[PDB]
Amino acid sequence: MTNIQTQLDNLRKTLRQYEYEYHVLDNPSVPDSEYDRLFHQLKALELEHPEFLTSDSPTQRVGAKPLSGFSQIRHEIPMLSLDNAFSDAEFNAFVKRIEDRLILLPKPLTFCCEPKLDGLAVSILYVNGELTQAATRGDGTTGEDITANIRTIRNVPLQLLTDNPPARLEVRGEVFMPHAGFERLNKYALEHNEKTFANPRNAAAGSLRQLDPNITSKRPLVLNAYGIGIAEGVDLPTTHYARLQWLKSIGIPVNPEIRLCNGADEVLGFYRDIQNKRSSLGYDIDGTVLKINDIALQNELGFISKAPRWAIAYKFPA
Amino acid sequence: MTNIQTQLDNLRKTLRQYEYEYHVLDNPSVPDSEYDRLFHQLKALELEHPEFLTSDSPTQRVGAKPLSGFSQIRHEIPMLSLDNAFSDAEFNAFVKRIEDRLILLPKPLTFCCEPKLDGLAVSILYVNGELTQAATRGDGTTGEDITANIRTIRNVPLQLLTDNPPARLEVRGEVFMPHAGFERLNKYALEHNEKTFANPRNAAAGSLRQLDPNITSKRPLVLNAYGIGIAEGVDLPTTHYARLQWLKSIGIPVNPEIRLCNGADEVLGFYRDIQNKRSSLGYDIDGTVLKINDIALQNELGFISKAPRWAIAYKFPA
Numbered sequence: 001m002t003n004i005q006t007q008l009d010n011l012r013k014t015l016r017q018y019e020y021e022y023h024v025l026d027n028p029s030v031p032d033s034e035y036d037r038l039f040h041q042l043k044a045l046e047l048e049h050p051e052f053l054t055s056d057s058p059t060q061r062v063g064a065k066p067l068s069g070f071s072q073i074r075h076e077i078p079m080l081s082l083d084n085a086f087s088d089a090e091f092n093a094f095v096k097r098i099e100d101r102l103i104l105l106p107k108p109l110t111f112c113c114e115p116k117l118d119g120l121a122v123s124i125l126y127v128n129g130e131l132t133q134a135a136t137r138g139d140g141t142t143g144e145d146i147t148a149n150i151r152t153i154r155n156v157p158l159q160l161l162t163d164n165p166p167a168r169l170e171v172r173g174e175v176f177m178p179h180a181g182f183e184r185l186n187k188y189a190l191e192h193n194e195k196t197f198a199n200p201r202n203a204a205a206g207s208l209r210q211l212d213p214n215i216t217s218k219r220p221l222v223l224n225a226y227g228i229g230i231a232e233g234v235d236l237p238t239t240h241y242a243r244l245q246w247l248k249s250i251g252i253p254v255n256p257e258i259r260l261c262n263g264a265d266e267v268l269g270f271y272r273d274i275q276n277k278r279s280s281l282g283y284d285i286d287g288t289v290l291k292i293n294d295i296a297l298q299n300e301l302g303f304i305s306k307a308p309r310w311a312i313a314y315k316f317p318a
Numbered sequence: 319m320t321n322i323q324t325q326l327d328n329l330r331k332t333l334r335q336y337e338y339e340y341h342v343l344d345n346p347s348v349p350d351s352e353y354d355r356l357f358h359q360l361k362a363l364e365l366e367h368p369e370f371l372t373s374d375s376p377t378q379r380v381g382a383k384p385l386s387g388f389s390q391i392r393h394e395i396p397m398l399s400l401d402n403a404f405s406d407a408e409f410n411a412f413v414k415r416i417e418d419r420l421i422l423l424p425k426p427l428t429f430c431c432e433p434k435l436d437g438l439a440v441s442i443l444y445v446n447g448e449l450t451q452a453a454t455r456g457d458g459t460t461g462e463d464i465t466a467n468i469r470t471i472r473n474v475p476l477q478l479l480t481d482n483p484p485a486r487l488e489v490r491g492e493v494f495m496p497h498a499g500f501e502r503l504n505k506y507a508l509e510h511n512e513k514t515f516a517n518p519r520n521a522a523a524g525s526l527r528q529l530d531p532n533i534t535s536k537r538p539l540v541l542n543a544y545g546i547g548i549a550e551g552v553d554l555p556t557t558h559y560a561r562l563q564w565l566k567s568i569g570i571p572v573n574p575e576i577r578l579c580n581g582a583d584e585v586l587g588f589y590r591d592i593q594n595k596r597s598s599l600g601y602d603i604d605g606t607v608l609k610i611n612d613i614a615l616q617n618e619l620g621f622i623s624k625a626p627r628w629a630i631a632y633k634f635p636a
């Protein structure tokens with residue numbers, strides 16, 4: 001044991017907890033200045049005692065050397081797309097089809113509802129709580145390794161906040177740029193005679209394809225987690241909402257507008273609520289994502305492979 | 319000009335036409351014996367004058383040498399899967415969803431309805447009317463080259479029956495084994511102390527994975543064409559039924575139980591009709607395939623990529 005190793009451990013623990021409170025809870029317990037006091041105290045100590053420098057320390061987000069080219073990653077579990085709807089009648093027809101397709105339709109039929117963000121789909125791997133890899137969705141089967149870029153995102157934890165993390169946990173989410181950050185960036189680009197971005201989605205997409213992590217770090221990107229891929233060494237909750245609440249309780253940023261709605265008319269109320277809140281969110285959204293909440297019902301319903309919307313095979317009963 | 323070249327041309331033309339009448343029209347104009355008289359007259363002449371032997375002649379279906387291994391083919395256009403339904407209520411919900419998803423719902427809403435065969439999905443390429451390649455569906459993106467096996471199928475034309483064939487035409491269909499053929503095969507297998515097949519689908523699947531075309535030829539396989547992939551140098555009809563009628567008019571076998579039905583209640587009548595005819599078809603079917611008939615409406619509706627059935631993105635209108 002040494003005093004300096006204990007001082008580093010305590011600084012890192014404290015700093016990870018303040019990041020959680022600021023980014024995930026939106027209720028920091030100390031001012032920004034106090035966080036910064038400790039952050040550069042940790043950075044200086046680590047540089048004066050490099051023997052105790054760790055790769056997942058809060059001061060190690062930015063890789064000092066720009067990359068040459070992104071490697072390709074094949075997803076262990078593929079990243080699927082979502083079916084879409086454009087009207088209440090269409091959504092009602094979607095629910096009516098699930099209602100008769102299910103063996104036993106429960107009363108109520110609960111949905112986990114969230115805003116649909118206008119961002120870049122990513123997959124982030126934590127091995128025994130530590131961030132080791134991150135990838136773009138790409139075509140859903142193969143993507144680009146953007147680990148160094150993802151590590152610069154301030155609300156992305158380099159270490160899960162739990163003493164017993166899963167053996168492996170793959171978090172899926174969307175990287176986006178909030179309005180305030182997007183406006184700030186364009187004022188900086190114009191003030192420094194550089195090109196501007198047409199919209200927040202283009203700015204986020206451009207920031208994630210930078211080969212220099214130092215540029216990505218200056219871009220105000222935010223992750224919002226909406227799913228889980230691989231999950232080894234853990235008993236995931238049996239509802240989709242409980243799984244998102246579990247991600248949040250271990251340090252992962254999740255959207256705070258997520259709700260549970262019983263039946264189509266409540267789900268339609270949420271859609272109109274979110275539609276009315278658009279002017280006040282501070283980030284771009286394209287719609288709402290409505291999912292069956294009960295996990296056993298999702299498994300029972302399953303997936304639809306790449307198929308035309310204009311054909312259907314009405315099979316005979318045995 | 320030579321007498322023997324004219325005699326070969328006339329024999330081939332005649333034999334291709336009798337094959338069309340026997341296999342596609344199910345109305346042969348001559349007895350089986352007359353067809354055979356000409357078939358082995360052509361075979362003998364070709365062997366006595368090998369200078370005039372053509373690769374697409376009716377006597378050239380079976381490659382004399384067994385293959386070593388099937389090469390892999392990547393489909394230019396991917397082979398999609400079908401969404402499925404299991405009840406009238408579910409089918410009605412599927413139509414109601416298309417009804418509101420369409421910009422302009424016509425009156426009537428016509429469907430091209432067919433039996434769903436229990437067979438092996440294949441893709442067959444004709445280049446300037448001649449059969450050059452055939453492939454298994456495989457995963458929908460890549461399959462196995464089964465050209466030599468497909469060439470042995472009696473109802474598959476080696477040459478399209480048209481003086482102006484498309485530059486390239488890819489026919490999509492299912493290879494199956496009718497009941498009478500399946501029963502015959504198992505009596506032969508049992509009489510020759512060999513293994514039997516559990517059902518016609520397993521027998522068809524086993525026959526198409528034979529590396530020896532000589533074995534496939536002894537297996538009574540039938541093609542039924544249900545679609546078109548590549549179609550260059552042709553103006554395909556603007557309805558799905560007209561496209562199937564066009565395939566049939568150029569020599570391609572198409573199922574004769576295909577009908578047009580206006581609206582869901584007529585489509586449901588077809589399903590019950592086919593369900594009642596099952597006992598009398600002479601081949602296995604699993605259900606019915608119901609497609610929007612108008613091609614512009616199919617294009618408007620489009621496809622659904624690999625997605626969960628339990629989620630939907632209700633997007634906001636602009």
Ligand SMILES: Cc1ccc(Cn2cc(C(N)=O)ccc2=O)c(C)c1
Nearest residue numbers: 018019022028030031032033035036
């Ligand atoms: C100078 C400075 C320091 C920190 C921050 C924001 N912030 C604050 C905390 C905090 N309050 O616990 C935690 C993490 C974080 O990133 C800004 C914008 C500027």
Ligand SMILES: Cc1ccc(Cn2cc(C(N)=O)ccc2=O)c(C)c1
Nearest residue numbers: 336337340346348349350351353354
């Ligand atoms: C001996 C023999 C010859 C032909 C056939 C069947 N068949 C008949 C014709 C025909 N009638 O024009 C055309 C093609 C064909 O394959 C069988 C089963 C047996």
Ligand SMILES: O=C(O)c1ccc2cccc(O)c2n1
Nearest residue numbers: 080081082226227289626629
């Ligand atoms: O497979 C999924 O659950 C899935 C796939 C794609 C998505 C895109 C946006 C939001 C989601 O919840 C998504 N969820």
Ligand SMILES: O=C(O)c1ccc2cccc(O)c2n1
Nearest residue numbers: 308311398399400544545607
């Ligand atoms: O993409 C298609 O049209 C398609 C795809 C797969 C099929 C399987 C059986 C019958 C069909 O008409 C099929 N059609």
